[PDB]
Amino acid sequence: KSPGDNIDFQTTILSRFDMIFIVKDDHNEERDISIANHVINIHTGNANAMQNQQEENGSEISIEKMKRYITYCRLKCAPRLSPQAAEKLSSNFVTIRKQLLINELESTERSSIPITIRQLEAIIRITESLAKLELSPIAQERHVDEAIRLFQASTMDAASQDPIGGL
Amino acid sequence: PDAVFGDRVRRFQEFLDTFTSYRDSVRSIQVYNSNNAANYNDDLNILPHRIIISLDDLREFDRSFWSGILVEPAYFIPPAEKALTDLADSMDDVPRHPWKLSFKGSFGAHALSPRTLTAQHLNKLVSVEGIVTKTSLVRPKLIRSVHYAAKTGRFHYRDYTDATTTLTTRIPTPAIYPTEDTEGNKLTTEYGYSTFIDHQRITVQEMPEMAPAGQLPRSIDVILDDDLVDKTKPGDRVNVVGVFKSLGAGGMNQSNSTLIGFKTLILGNTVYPLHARSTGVAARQMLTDFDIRNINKLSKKKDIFDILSQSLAPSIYGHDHIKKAILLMLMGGVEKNLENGSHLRGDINILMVGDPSTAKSQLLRFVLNTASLAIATTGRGSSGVGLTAAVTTDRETGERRLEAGAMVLADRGVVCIDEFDKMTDVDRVAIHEVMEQQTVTIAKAGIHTTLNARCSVIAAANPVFGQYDVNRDPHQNIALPDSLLSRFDLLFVVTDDINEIRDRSISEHVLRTHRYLPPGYLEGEPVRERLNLSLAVGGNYNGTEIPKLVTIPFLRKYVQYAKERVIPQLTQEAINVIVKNYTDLRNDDNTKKSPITARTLETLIRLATAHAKVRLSKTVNKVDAKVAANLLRFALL
Ligand SMILES: Nc1ncnc2c1ncn2[C@@H]1O[C@H](COP(=O)(O)OP(=O)(O)O)[C@@H](O)[C@H]1O
Ligand SMILES: [Mg+2]
């Protein structure tokens, strides 16, 4: 079935979301063993000790400290995209529509998942969100590439799950 | 005679002599009143005797008197009112009611809300902004009763005062209504020689956007006197300036023995209706001479229609014909009222339908922000009684009264309806009467009323498949009934067809739009949001007072001026064009998005009149008719 055929609501609702994830049932033995081991770690209490050790190390931060940090970065920082970061977004936005146009012209059926200007503003928001982590007033090209990778990992592979958006 | 009172009177004399604007304002009121009196004597309106006083000017002149006005208004406002009365009596001797005072300017810690009003602010001058929820019946209050004794043939009188009339407390001497004279002769009341001052009480609750989202709201009663009566309706956003007073005894007397506390209210001196977003108060701007000259020098140009249109929402790429339609709707045509009571529409209705993410909701939000009286509604969120009217019961009289819906509240205004397709059929057939007859008829249990609903309507709809299809029938695409389709003056289908050059240009425009910084803002700092409350009186970033494309504050000065000033009249040269185009559209072989009826002819007349309003022309010309005709062709083909 199509991604729009699986959902019990209108396909235009999907366009209003910036990033859509399609979570899969892998049905693999080695992944099931690992996830079962992880859940048993949580239930036993080894996960609590490991998380405390990593919080002492610093690879994991505390939840209250993250909450206060999120508040601080929300009030302090509001990044701006650089002019050299704009032409790459304008290219990576128009290539998706170039693929979508020829796919929809060949199929003569409209894709159930659309790509619109709201998705461009979504990638802009992701880019200026990655720079807000660093307390960086300027969004650089290195944030743009991560934003494109995040958009590929969420919206574009879900679009490729649509046979019309693929081909 | 109190010495410190006289010293304060003399100090306010010095302040009034220093600032000559108030001296000119008193004289200007007096000449208006005397000219109207002389007109009534030879062959109308009267101005009240009160003066707007700036608190900042008083602070600069005398900080002690300014702090006295704010902190102890009972000891400082009556001397200043006495001083103003002395000045007005000294100037009005050549050509009787004592003069009053109003206050404007910054209040500092005295700029409060009904939640923020506390008992430390009692006996202080406070400025309180909120929403009017309840208003009382306007009631006359007897001030002086005049009586006639027929036995002696003489007229007697008695004066009455209450605690709300004076800022300072007085010994309460309750003098009864006299029915005897001092000798025992019967008195008859002389109605019409007695004086009655209008009195009102309103309730000001804190604004629902400035109130916490879960808590019950806090409110306060405001008492208004003769000239401040009926300056508000329920639902208005208001700023009331007045003295936060305590009255009576809070149960300390033996007869009273209860913990209502001391009853507290604001003795209002000043009421400012405020314009907020999607409210019933219309936004108005005071036009200076320089702005009028700017509007008139833009009016003589030839590209003024293509300059105001592109300057509506320059942050939206394309939709150039929709911007023109929104501008002509904001002009709004001319309403005709014939001699037999028959009414003809003047305002323009626009429906937009098409693909998602095509800036339809952004255009709706722009019209909500740029129009004087725009109200925003949603499809299923509003109901039949939500838009038109409802019937409730008030506490005092117990009789049924009306609560005005969004359409009635937007009389002579703008209704922005989002998600037009998802609306219920009862509310649809309610909207059929509003969009053509421009009235709302309520026939409920006991009540039968007709309300004015003279409105412009902008609607945003979506096709039933979610995306517009070229090969399918547009009647199948929209799937809206014929009668609603005929009501809308202009219907715009906006498809999200994608081309490489167009996607490139829109991508560059949106990316360069997201790289904007407001003036005075640092690079990393976030822009703060301040809610816009404006006082109602009576893609390039750098647009600064009509260089190429006008600013939004100037554009609504132009629209306001064109609406109040020019009333264009149709002429034969436009009539021939609209008749020929209407006949051609009626007999066209082409398929159209919108059906063709006699409503399209009146749409052509309204659009020609609206274009004439843009040019500030008192006459409708051929060039107006042709642009009104080929604007309609785009919405049809
Ligand atoms: N032609 C356009 N020009 C500029 N911005 C646009 C355009 N079309 C869409 N957008 C942007 O895409 C976002 C999606 O919202 P919107 O397009 O208003 O939704 P809808 O069209 O479904 O009402 C908006 O924030 C708007 O700024
Ligand atoms: Mg929308």
Short mmCIF file of N, CA, C and O and ligand atoms in Angstrom, two decimals, chain A residues 12 15-16 116-121 125, chain B residues 313-319 323 352 354-365 418-419 460-462 494 496 502 506 509-510 513-514, ligand 1:
data_model
loop_
_atom_site.label_atom_id
_atom_site.label_comp_id
_atom_site.label_asym_id
_atom_site.label_seq_id
_atom_site.Cartn_x
_atom_site.Cartn_y
_atom_site.Cartn_z
N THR A 12 -3.19 15.62 2.52
CA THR A 12 -2.73 17.00 2.63
C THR A 12 -2.28 17.33 4.04
O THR A 12 -1.56 18.32 4.25
N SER A 15 1.53 17.09 4.32
CA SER A 15 2.32 18.22 3.83
C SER A 15 2.55 19.26 4.92
O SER A 15 3.51 20.03 4.83
N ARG A 16 1.69 19.30 5.94
CA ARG A 16 1.83 20.31 6.98
C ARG A 16 2.93 19.96 7.98
O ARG A 16 3.36 20.83 8.75
N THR A 116 6.50 20.51 -1.32
CA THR A 116 6.01 21.87 -1.51
C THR A 116 6.99 22.88 -0.94
O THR A 116 8.07 22.54 -0.46
N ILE A 117 6.61 24.16 -1.03
CA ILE A 117 7.42 25.26 -0.51
C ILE A 117 7.48 25.20 1.01
O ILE A 117 8.48 25.62 1.63
N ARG A 118 6.44 24.66 1.64
CA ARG A 118 6.46 24.46 3.08
C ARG A 118 7.57 23.50 3.49
O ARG A 118 8.16 23.64 4.56
N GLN A 119 7.90 22.54 2.61
CA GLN A 119 9.05 21.68 2.87
C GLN A 119 10.36 22.44 2.76
O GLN A 119 11.32 22.15 3.49
N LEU A 120 10.43 23.43 1.86
CA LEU A 120 11.62 24.29 1.80
C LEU A 120 11.79 25.07 3.10
O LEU A 120 12.89 25.14 3.65
N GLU A 121 10.70 25.65 3.61
CA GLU A 121 10.77 26.36 4.88
C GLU A 121 11.07 25.40 6.03
O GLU A 121 11.69 25.78 7.02
N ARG A 125 14.10 25.68 8.61
CA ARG A 125 13.93 25.58 10.05
C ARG A 125 14.88 24.56 10.66
O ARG A 125 15.44 24.81 11.73
N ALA B 313 1.56 42.01 -0.18
CA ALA B 313 2.36 40.96 0.44
C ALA B 313 3.53 40.68 -0.49
O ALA B 313 3.50 39.72 -1.28
N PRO B 314 4.57 41.52 -0.45
CA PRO B 314 5.74 41.28 -1.30
C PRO B 314 6.53 40.04 -0.92
O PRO B 314 7.35 39.58 -1.72
N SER B 315 6.30 39.48 0.26
CA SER B 315 6.95 38.26 0.70
C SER B 315 6.28 37.01 0.14
O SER B 315 6.74 35.90 0.44
N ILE B 316 5.22 37.16 -0.64
CA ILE B 316 4.58 36.06 -1.35
C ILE B 316 4.91 36.20 -2.83
O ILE B 316 4.59 37.23 -3.44
N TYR B 317 5.55 35.18 -3.39
CA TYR B 317 5.84 35.19 -4.82
C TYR B 317 4.58 34.92 -5.63
O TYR B 317 3.78 34.05 -5.28
N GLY B 318 4.42 35.66 -6.72
CA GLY B 318 3.29 35.45 -7.60
C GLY B 318 1.98 35.93 -7.00
O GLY B 318 1.95 36.80 -6.13
N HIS B 319 0.89 35.33 -7.48
CA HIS B 319 -0.48 35.69 -7.10
C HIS B 319 -0.76 37.17 -7.33
O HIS B 319 -1.45 37.82 -6.55
N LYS B 323 -3.58 39.79 -5.56
CA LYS B 323 -3.28 41.03 -4.85
C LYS B 323 -4.13 42.19 -5.35
O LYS B 323 -4.59 43.01 -4.55
N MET B 352 -10.82 31.73 -2.93
CA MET B 352 -9.59 31.13 -3.43
C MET B 352 -9.62 29.64 -3.15
O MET B 352 -9.89 29.21 -2.03
N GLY B 354 -7.52 25.81 -4.28
CA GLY B 354 -6.43 25.19 -5.00
C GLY B 354 -5.57 24.34 -4.08
O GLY B 354 -6.00 23.96 -2.99
N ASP B 355 -4.35 24.09 -4.55
CA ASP B 355 -3.44 23.15 -3.94
C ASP B 355 -2.96 23.65 -2.58
O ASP B 355 -2.96 24.86 -2.32
N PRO B 356 -2.56 22.75 -1.69
CA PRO B 356 -1.98 23.17 -0.42
C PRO B 356 -0.62 23.84 -0.61
O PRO B 356 0.03 23.70 -1.64
N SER B 357 -0.22 24.58 0.44
CA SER B 357 1.04 25.32 0.48
C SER B 357 1.14 26.33 -0.67
O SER B 357 2.19 26.47 -1.30
N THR B 358 0.04 27.03 -0.94
CA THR B 358 0.00 28.06 -1.96
C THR B 358 -0.27 29.45 -1.38
O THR B 358 -0.83 30.30 -2.09
N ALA B 359 0.09 29.68 -0.12
CA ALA B 359 0.00 30.96 0.58
C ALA B 359 -1.42 31.50 0.68
O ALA B 359 -1.62 32.72 0.75
N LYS B 360 -2.43 30.63 0.69
CA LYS B 360 -3.80 31.09 0.88
C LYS B 360 -4.04 31.53 2.32
O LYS B 360 -4.61 32.60 2.57
N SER B 361 -3.62 30.71 3.29
CA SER B 361 -3.78 31.07 4.69
C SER B 361 -2.90 32.26 5.05
O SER B 361 -3.26 33.08 5.89
N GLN B 362 -1.73 32.36 4.41
CA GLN B 362 -0.87 33.52 4.63
C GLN B 362 -1.53 34.79 4.10
O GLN B 362 -1.43 35.85 4.72
N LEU B 363 -2.21 34.70 2.95
CA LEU B 363 -2.94 35.85 2.43
C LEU B 363 -4.11 36.21 3.34
O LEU B 363 -4.39 37.40 3.56
N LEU B 364 -4.81 35.21 3.88
CA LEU B 364 -5.87 35.47 4.85
C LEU B 364 -5.32 36.18 6.08
O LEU B 364 -5.93 37.13 6.58
N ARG B 365 -4.17 35.73 6.58
CA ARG B 365 -3.58 36.34 7.75
C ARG B 365 -3.07 37.75 7.44
O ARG B 365 -3.07 38.61 8.33
N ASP B 418 -11.21 30.82 6.74
CA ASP B 418 -10.33 29.74 6.34
C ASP B 418 -11.06 28.40 6.42
O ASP B 418 -11.99 28.23 7.21
N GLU B 419 -10.59 27.45 5.62
CA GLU B 419 -11.26 26.16 5.40
C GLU B 419 -12.75 26.34 5.07
O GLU B 419 -13.63 25.87 5.79
N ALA B 460 -10.95 30.71 1.62
CA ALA B 460 -9.94 29.77 1.15
C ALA B 460 -10.50 28.37 1.26
O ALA B 460 -10.90 27.94 2.35
N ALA B 461 -10.56 27.66 0.14
CA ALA B 461 -11.09 26.31 0.08
C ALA B 461 -10.05 25.38 -0.55
O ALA B 461 -9.04 25.83 -1.10
N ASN B 462 -10.31 24.08 -0.47
CA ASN B 462 -9.47 23.06 -1.06
C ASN B 462 -10.34 22.17 -1.93
O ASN B 462 -11.53 21.99 -1.65
N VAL B 494 -5.81 28.24 -7.81
CA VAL B 494 -4.37 28.37 -7.65
C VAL B 494 -3.80 26.95 -7.63
O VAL B 494 -3.84 26.26 -6.61
N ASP B 496 -0.63 24.25 -7.95
CA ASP B 496 0.80 24.20 -7.67
C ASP B 496 1.51 23.42 -8.78
O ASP B 496 2.17 22.40 -8.56
N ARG B 502 10.40 28.50 -12.40
CA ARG B 502 9.50 29.03 -11.37
C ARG B 502 9.89 28.51 -9.99
O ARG B 502 9.87 29.28 -9.02
N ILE B 506 11.01 30.94 -6.91
CA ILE B 506 10.33 30.90 -5.62
C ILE B 506 11.30 30.49 -4.52
O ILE B 506 11.26 31.03 -3.41
N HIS B 509 13.42 33.48 -3.74
CA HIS B 509 12.64 34.50 -3.05
C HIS B 509 12.40 34.14 -1.59
O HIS B 509 12.54 35.00 -0.71
N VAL B 510 12.05 32.88 -1.31
CA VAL B 510 11.79 32.48 0.07
C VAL B 510 13.07 32.46 0.88
O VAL B 510 13.09 32.89 2.04
N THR B 513 13.96 35.89 1.68
CA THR B 513 12.99 36.42 2.63
C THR B 513 13.30 35.99 4.06
O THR B 513 13.10 36.78 4.99
N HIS B 514 13.84 34.79 4.24
CA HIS B 514 14.23 34.29 5.56
C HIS B 514 15.53 34.90 6.06
O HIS B 514 15.93 34.62 7.19
N1 LIG C 1 4.15 31.75 -3.45
C1 LIG C 1 4.70 31.79 -2.21
N2 LIG C 1 5.54 32.78 -1.85
C2 LIG C 1 6.09 32.84 -0.63
N3 LIG C 1 5.86 31.93 0.33
C3 LIG C 1 5.04 30.88 0.11
C4 LIG C 1 4.40 30.74 -1.21
N4 LIG C 1 3.65 29.63 -1.15
C5 LIG C 1 3.80 29.09 0.09
N5 LIG C 1 4.62 29.84 0.84
C6 LIG C 1 5.02 29.56 2.24
O1 LIG C 1 4.64 28.22 2.59
C7 LIG C 1 4.09 28.18 3.91
C8 LIG C 1 2.84 27.30 3.89
O2 LIG C 1 1.67 27.99 4.32
P1 LIG C 1 0.53 28.33 3.25
O3 LIG C 1 1.21 28.27 1.90
O4 LIG C 1 -0.17 29.60 3.68
O5 LIG C 1 -0.50 27.09 3.35
P2 LIG C 1 -1.82 27.00 2.43
O6 LIG C 1 -1.41 27.49 1.07
O7 LIG C 1 -2.16 25.53 2.47
O8 LIG C 1 -2.83 27.88 3.12
C9 LIG C 1 3.79 29.61 4.33
O9 LIG C 1 4.51 29.92 5.52
C10 LIG C 1 4.28 30.48 3.19
O10 LIG C 1 5.16 31.50 3.69
#
